[PDB]
Design a protein around this ligand. Sequence first.
Ligand SMILES: *[C@@H]1O[C@H](CO)[C@@H](O[C@@H]2O[C@H](CO)[C@@H](O)[C@H](O)[C@H]2NC(C)=O)[C@H](O)[C@H]1NC(C)=O
Ligand SMILES: *[C@@H]1O[C@H](CO)[C@@H](O[C@@H]2O[C@H](CO)[C@@H](O)[C@H](O)[C@H]2NC(C)=O)[C@H](O)[C@H]1NC(C)=O
Ligand SMILES: *[C@@H]1O[C@H](CO)[C@@H](O[C@@H]2O[C@H](CO)[C@@H](O)[C@H](O)[C@H]2NC(C)=O)[C@H](O)[C@H]1NC(C)=O
Ligand SMILES: *[C@@H]1O[C@H](CO)[C@@H](O[C@@H]2O[C@H](CO)[C@@H](O)[C@H](O)[C@H]2NC(C)=O)[C@H](O)[C@H]1NC(C)=O
Ligand SMILES: *[C@@H]1O[C@H](CO)[C@@H](O)[C@H](O)[C@H]1NC(C)=O
Ligand SMILES: *[C@@H]1O[C@H](CO)[C@@H](O)[C@H](O)[C@H]1NC(C)=O
Ligand SMILES: *[C@@H]1O[C@H](CO)[C@@H](O)[C@H](O)[C@H]1NC(C)=O
Lengths: 84, 313, 228
Amino acid sequence: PTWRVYSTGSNVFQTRAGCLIGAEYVNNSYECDIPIGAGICASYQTSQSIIAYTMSLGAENSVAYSNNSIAIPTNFTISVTTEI
Amino acid sequence: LPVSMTKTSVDCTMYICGDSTECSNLLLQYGSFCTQLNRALTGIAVEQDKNTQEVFAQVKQIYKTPPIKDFGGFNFSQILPDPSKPSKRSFIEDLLFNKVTQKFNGLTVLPPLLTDEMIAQYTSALLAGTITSGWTFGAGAALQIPFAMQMAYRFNGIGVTQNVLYENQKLIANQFNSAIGKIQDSLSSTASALGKLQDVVNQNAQALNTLVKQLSSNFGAISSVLNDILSRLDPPEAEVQIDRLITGRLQSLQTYVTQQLIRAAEIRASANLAAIKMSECVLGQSKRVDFCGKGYHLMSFPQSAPHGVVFLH
Amino acid sequence: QKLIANQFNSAIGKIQDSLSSTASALGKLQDVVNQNAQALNTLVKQLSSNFGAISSVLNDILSRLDPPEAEVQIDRLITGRLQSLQTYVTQQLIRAAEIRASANLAAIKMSECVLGQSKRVDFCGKGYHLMSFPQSAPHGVVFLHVTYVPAQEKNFTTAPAICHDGKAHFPREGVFVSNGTHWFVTQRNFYEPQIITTDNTFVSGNCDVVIGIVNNTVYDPLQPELDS
Ligand SMILES: *[C@@H]1O[C@H](CO)[C@@H](O[C@@H]2O[C@H](CO)[C@@H](O)[C@H](O)[C@H]2NC(C)=O)[C@H](O)[C@H]1NC(C)=O
Ligand SMILES: *[C@@H]1O[C@H](CO)[C@@H](O[C@@H]2O[C@H](CO)[C@@H](O)[C@H](O)[C@H]2NC(C)=O)[C@H](O)[C@H]1NC(C)=O
Ligand SMILES: *[C@@H]1O[C@H](CO)[C@@H](O[C@@H]2O[C@H](CO)[C@@H](O)[C@H](O)[C@H]2NC(C)=O)[C@H](O)[C@H]1NC(C)=O
Ligand SMILES: *[C@@H]1O[C@H](CO)[C@@H](O[C@@H]2O[C@H](CO)[C@@H](O)[C@H](O)[C@H]2NC(C)=O)[C@H](O)[C@H]1NC(C)=O
Ligand SMILES: *[C@@H]1O[C@H](CO)[C@@H](O)[C@H](O)[C@H]1NC(C)=O
Ligand SMILES: *[C@@H]1O[C@H](CO)[C@@H](O)[C@H](O)[C@H]1NC(C)=O
Ligand SMILES: *[C@@H]1O[C@H](CO)[C@@H](O)[C@H](O)[C@H]1NC(C)=O
C-alpha cells in the first residue's frame, strides 16, 4: 500500500513538469533548494514536511534613480571567496 | 550565442524493446548499458540548467527601473519590458521569439528549469541595474547614479574626456536612438541573423528524427516490426534475429548519445563564453579590443532569446 | 591599515571555519573522482555480462567446449567486451576534454589573478579584485581571491559640471557631490570630499551648452597667498 498511499489523498499537485504527489504546495516564495522543473522547487520545512513552491528569484529592490541623485560608498569591506 | 539545448531523455528499454518482454529478457544479458547511457543523458540535462544558471543568474537582486524614464534623452523603450503585454518580454524580445521557429518511442523532453518569464525577468533586472547604477551593482550593492554621468565617465575608458559627451549629449542621444531603430528594423526584416540558434534547434530536431527513423531499418533482420518476428518465428530462430535487431538499435542509440555528448560539450563551451561576455560587456567596460563587439566598447545590453542570449553592444 | 589588516585576518578565519565545517564546497572535485570511479566500476561489472554467451567466465567456455564452437562463443564475448571498452574510452576522451578546458581556464586565472591584477569584472572572484593566493588540492587547485567590496552608501545630490565664471568646469578624476548646502569634488569609490579647486578640474567651453550645470564658486590656490 506504499505506492497507493503516495498516489491518493489531497497531497497531489499538477505541474508542467508532471504530477507531484506527497509534497504540499505553498504560496510562500523561497530560494530553489531542489529543482523540480518549470520554476517549481521542493525543500524540507516546518511539523516538518516536504513543501513545493515557486522559486524566488531574489529580493526585489526598487533603485531610487533620478536625474540628479548619486550614491557614494562611505566605507569598505575586504572579503575572501573560495573558488575550485 | 546559444546557451542550451532541449533537455532530451530516453527510456532505453522502451526504445529498444517497446513492451516486448522477450526483448527485455535478451537486453538483460547486455548489463549496465541502459543505465550508463541514460546516466549520460541525465548529466547533459543537468548541464543545460547549469549553463543557464551560470549565464543569467549572475545578478543577486531583481532590480526594477522607476516609472520616470528621464534618461537624459536616451529612449530605452525598445529594450525595457512591456507592462501592457501579458509576458513581460521587451519589444525586441517579441521579434526574437516570433522569428525563431516523438513521445511515441520512449523519447521525452523535460522542461527547462527556468521558464521564459523568469529569464525575461533576469534580463529586465540586468537592464535596470546597468541603466540606473552602472557597474556598481555588479561588484556589490547597486548605487544609483544619473545615466548621463555614467556615459560621461564611461568615455574615460576610451581615452576621451567627458567634456565631449556633455557638449554633444543631444547628438549622442539621436545617434543612439537611430541605431536602436536600425536594430529593430534588421531583426524585423528577413535577415538571417538568428541562424546560429536555428541551426542548434534544427540539428537536435533532425538528430531525433534520424534516431526514430533508424527503427525502421532491419539491420539485416527479416523485418523491422518486432512483433512480426515473434509472430512468424518460434523462439529458437527468433533469438538470433531479435539479437541482430537489438544490436542494431543499441548501435543507433550509442551513436545518438555520443553525438549528443559532443554537441553538449560544444554548447557549454559557448555558454561559458556567453557568461564571461555578460560579466565583462554588461557588468563593466572591457578594454579587450573587439571582445564586446567591434570598435571601442561602451556598454552592452542583454536580451533573452530561445535557448540563447542576444547581446546589443 | 589596521582596520584592513584586522578585516583580512578575520576573513581568513571565516574561510578556515567554512572549509572545516561539515558542509563541503569541494563537490566539484568529488564529482570528478566519483565519475572516474563510476566509469571504472561499470567497466569492471561489464566483464560479468555474458552477451548471449553461455557464461561470462572464459575458462569455462575453454574447458566446457571444444574449439570449433568455442571460437563463436568467444567471438560474442569479444564483441561485447570490445564495445564496452570503446564506450569507456570515448567517454574518457570527452571528460578529458572538459578537464583540459577547465585546466586552461585555471592557468589563465593563475596568470591573471595570482601574478597580476585583472580589470575583468567578476573574473577573479566577486567584486573588485585585489589579488589571489593559490592552494593545492587533490586533482585540482583552490584560489583564494581577495576582493574589495564597498559598503555604507549615502545619498547625495550632484551636478555633471560646475559654472564659475562662464567657463564650464569638470572634475579631473572625481565627481561633484553636495551634502545639501555645499558642493564638493570627491573620489569615485570612497567618500572623501575636497574643496573644488582649479587643480582638480579642467575647463572646457561655455556653460550654456552643458545640460544640468549648477552655478558654484571655484577656488583658486594662488591668489589667497599672493600677498604682494
Ligand atoms: C567603517 O566601518 C568600519 C567597520 O569595520 C570601522 O572600523 C571599525 O572596525 C572594527 C572591526 O575591525 C569594529 O570592531 C569597529 O566597531 C569599527 N568602528 C567603527 C567606527 O564602526 C571604520 O572606522 C568605519 N570608517 C568610517 C566611519 O568611515
Ligand atoms: C520613445 O519611443 C517610443 C516608441 O517609439 C515612443 O512611443 C511611441 O512612438 C511612436 C513613434 O515610434 C509614436 O508614433 C507613438 O505616438 C508613441 N507613443 C507614445 C507612448 O507616446 C515614445 O513616444 C518615445 N518617447 C519617449 C521618450 O517615451
Ligand atoms: C556641509 O559641509 C559644509 C562645508 O563644510 C558645511 O558648512 C560649514 O562650513 C564650514 C566651512 O567649510 C565648516 O567649518 C563647517 O564644518 C560646515 N558645517 C558643517 C555642519 O559641516 C555644511 O553645514 C554641511 N552641511 C551638512 C549637511 O552637514
Ligand atoms: C547661472 O548664472 C547665469 C547668469 O546669471 C544664469 O542665467 C541667467 O542669466 C541672466 C543674465 O545674466 C540673469 O539675469 C539671470 O539671473 C540668470 N539666471 C539665474 C538663475 O541666475 C543661469 O540661469 C544660472 N544658473 C543657475 C543654475 O543658477
Ligand atoms: C495562494 O495562491 C492561490 C493561487 O490561486 C490563491 O488562490 C490563494 O488565495 C493564495 N492564498 C494565500 C493565503 O495567499
Ligand atoms: C535616497 O533618498 C530616497 C528618497 O528620499 C530614498 O527612497 C532612498 O532610500 C535613499 N537612499 C539611501 C541609500 O538612503
Ligand atoms: C530633473 O527632473 C526634474 C523633474 O522632472 C526637472 O524639474 C529638472 O529640470 C530635471 N533636471 C535635469 C538637469 O534634467
